[PDB]
Every structure is written in C-alpha cells, then in structure tokens.
C-alpha cells in the first residue's frame, strides 16, 4: 500500500518548509490546510521517508 | 539658523520637567509648536509635509510599542491594480531585510464595502499608526476613510510614489517606503497660524540626537515658510521660546 501523488507532493512541501518541527507544521495554515494532529502528519512523513529520502 | 545650545538647554530642562515624582502620552510626546504669519490660510489642505530627518524615530517607535500597550502598525492603501498584483510576502522579503514590516495592505474597495460602517471604520483605523496611501487614490480618501481619521497626525495618510514613470513597479515602492519610514517625519498644515510638530517618543531620542532632529526641521520650515515664533513643549508644559523671528 502506497500514497497518492497529491499526498506525496503535499508532504514534499511540508518537509522542505519546516523539516521535522511537527508543532510548527500543524500550527501552519497555508500548507497544512486540513488541521490534522502531530501523529497524523509524522506517520505519513515516515512512509514518505521510506519511498524517498 | 538656530543655535544648537539653546535647544540643548531646551530639551534637557524638559528632561527635568518630565522627571517628576494620559501618562503614556504626556511624558512621552516630544512636540514643537511653530507659528506663522498665516499658514495656508484660505484652503483646507490635508497633505503631510514629509520633513527629511537624519535619524529615524520610527525604528525607535517600533520597539517601545511592543513594550507599551498599543501595537504600532503600518497600513498601505493601494488601488485595484496592485493588490491583485502584489502580496505581503514580496513586501516582507524586501523590507524585513531592513526590518520594517507592512502589516496590512488594503484596497480602495475595502474602505467602502467592508469597513463602511462608522463603528468598524473607527475600529479599523484607530488601530493603525502609519497610514500609507498610493497616489492614485490619495486624493479620494476623505470621502472613504472618514473625517475623524484626519484629526490625528498618525491616521492621516501619506502619499507615496509607486509608479515608475506611469507604470507601477514593486521596486519603486520598496525603497520609497523605507524613505518615508526611517528618514521622514509628517506634519500637517492647518489654515490657522498655529502648527505643532509631534516629534515623537521622549523615551527615544537620545537628546543629542533629538537636537539634530529639531534643528534640521527648523531648516526646512524657515526656507519653505515665513514663520513668527517657535516653541518646544512637552504636553502642556510652560512653553519654551526656542526661536524668535520678527
């Protein structure tokens, strides 16, 4: 089970902007539109870091 | 030209008068009152004479507004062409490089539809302190932003050149906003004979620098205007005769 094209490209935007600051990442408004928790974003980034860098 | 030493004896004796055992404005507001044989007597202008100043009192005003209660905020009024063109991120990228910061840019539209209520307009305007306005619409504003907003010297807008010979460019505004911010001081022009120059924050203006600001103003007033009498005044002190023309 992989992730979608938009999801991957959206995660690229978050990683390049903040890095690994999940608190800043979920208090962000422009990139993290759907106000997901720290646990949601980091889990999806872990899956992203497996397929990519 | 005025002597430097009377101004030093003017400012530091007011440092005495301010060092005594509303208070946000009475202690803090260095102002200087200028008189004329009839300033602009027959026409009710609203321009702001942007007096060239060597050393800013706005980067000073930037800090102490964080320590005091009211936030110093900067407005830009634009026409329709530019707001659709330019964001705050482009402003922030080329003004935080100094460290000045446009909080809100406001269209000419927004003054008449989403702040058209007198209550909300007074709520919107009275927050801000540096009101800047692009030249195409500067001349339309007292219908828009009300007459109450022109009673102050903060809230009255400043015309600022944003067009690079008939066409707008961001480069034109970016160095011009710095020009008004750090180098310029407003003063209005009543059709009376009395005029004050609210010079600024008495917590700032290290008073050797303050005399540099006062004397430089007196250059740009005596050359541009006939004048009668000049007075420095912390807010309702005894008035101090600095200069005496005849």
């Amino acid at each position: 089970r992989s992730q979608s094209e938009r999801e991957e490209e959206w995660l690229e935007k978050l990683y390049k902007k903040h890095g690994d600051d999940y608190k800043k990442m979920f208090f962000d408004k422009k990139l993290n539109i759907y106000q997901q928790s720290e646990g949601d974003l980091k889990r999806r980034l872990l899956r992203w870091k497996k397929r990519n860098g | 030209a005025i002597p430097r030493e009377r101004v030093i004896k003017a400012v530091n004796e007011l440092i005495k008068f301010t060092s005594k055992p509303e208070e946000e404005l009475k202690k803090d507001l260095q102002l200087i009152v200028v008189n004329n044989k009839s300033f602009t007597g027959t026409s009710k202008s609203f321009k702001l004479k942007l007096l060239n100043v060597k050393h800013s009192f706005y980067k000073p005003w930037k800090e102490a507004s964080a320590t005091a209660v009211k936030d110093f905020k900067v407005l830009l009024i634009l026409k329709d062409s530019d707001i659709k063109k330019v964001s705050e991120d482009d402003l922030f990228d080329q003004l935080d490089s100094e460290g000045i910061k446009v909080d809100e840019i406001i269209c000419g539209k927004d003054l008449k539809t989403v702040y058209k209520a007198y209550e909300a307009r007074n709520a919107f305007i009275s927050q801000f302190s540096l009101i800047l306005a692009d030249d195409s619409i500067v001349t339309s504003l007292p219908k828009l932003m009300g007459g109450k907003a022109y009673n102050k010297v903060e809230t009255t807008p400043i015309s600022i050149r944003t067009h690079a010979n008939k066409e707008f460019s961001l480069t034109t505004l970016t160095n011009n906003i710095k020009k008004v911010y750090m180098n310029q001081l407003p003063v209005k022009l009543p059709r009376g004979t009395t005029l004050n120059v609210h010079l600024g924050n008495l917590e700032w203006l290290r008073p050797e620098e303050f005399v540099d600001n006062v004397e430089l103003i007196s250059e740009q007033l005596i050359k541009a205007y006939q004048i009668r009498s000049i007075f420095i005044k912390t807010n309702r002190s005894p008035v101090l005769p600095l200069y005496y023309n005849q």
Binding site: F26 | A66, A68, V69, A123, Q127
Partner: protein
Amino acid sequence: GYVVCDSDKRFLLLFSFLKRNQKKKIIVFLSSCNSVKYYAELLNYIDLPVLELHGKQKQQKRTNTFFEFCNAERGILICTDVAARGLDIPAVDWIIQFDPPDDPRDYIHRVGRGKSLMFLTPNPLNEYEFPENKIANVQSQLEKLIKSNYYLHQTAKDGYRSYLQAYASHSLKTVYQIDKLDLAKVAKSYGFPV
C-alpha cells in the same frame, strides 16, 4: 491587593498587564491545570513568551522547565495553584491571582516570603485603579482565532468546561455559581457559552 473587573474583560485586562510588564518575573495563578493549557496556548500564538506548568504533564518535564524560570531573569510562567504550592521563588515581584484560590484561608499565609492583586466582580493591602479604555483590542483577533484551528477551539472548550467545574467545587458561599455565563465565555471569547 485586588482589581475590580467584570467577567468580559478579565482576560483582556490580564493581557494588558502582561504586555505592559514584560521585564519582570511575574506569576499568574489560575485554577485548573486544564485551563493553563489554554492561556499558555494563546499567548505563544498571540506571541508572548510565556511558560506553562500544570498537572497534565510529566514530572521532570514540569521540573526542568520550571527550573528554567528559576534561573531566568525576565520572563513569566503560568501555573496552577496546586503545582506551585510549596515551591515559591523569592525572585519574583508580582503574584497576580486570577481566580479565587483553592484554600482562601491559607492563601494569605503563603504570601509572606511578592506583590498581590486579584480579580473579582461581587466578591493587608489596597486595590488599584484601571483606565478602562486601555485594554488591548485583541478580541477581534481572538474570535477569528478561536474559530480557525479546532485545536485552539478544543482547548478553549476544556479551558471553559474545567474552569467552571472548579468554580463550583469551591469552599465559599460568595464564590458559588451566581455569575452569568454570558461573560465568562467572553473571558474565553465565545459567541455562545458552549
């Protein structure tokens, strides 16, 4: 000793007294450990560098970060009545208690080691004045902000649900549920009191 204020602008006055006083080691005392999640989360998001102490976090997480205040010079922490009990720092000047305390009797005894004022609508030292038109107009900023994030909306909610429970679970005959809920919601800035 105290400052008389209505429930609308109780929080709005507090934000004024913090911004005007930004050099001194000052302490607020609030009731709920749930509540000082809320007032900490606003002030870092309306940008005052505050500190936060409450029961809902770990021990050395609480301790080592409380340790940062004790060696500091400037800033401010927000803590509960309970977690700060027994651990007064002599390096402090303002103890403002927002709430009626846990024990009102034994509260005066814990002063004398630190200047005090409280906040009360109907409910030694003197009061202070307050010029009423000086409070910060951030309630326009906050009402947009309480609607936009949902985390800040949730923590506003728990900061309200837990505020009034503790207000009912108190000792005194004076401090018993007379207060109108139209205005305590405005201390946490709602349109409707949840």
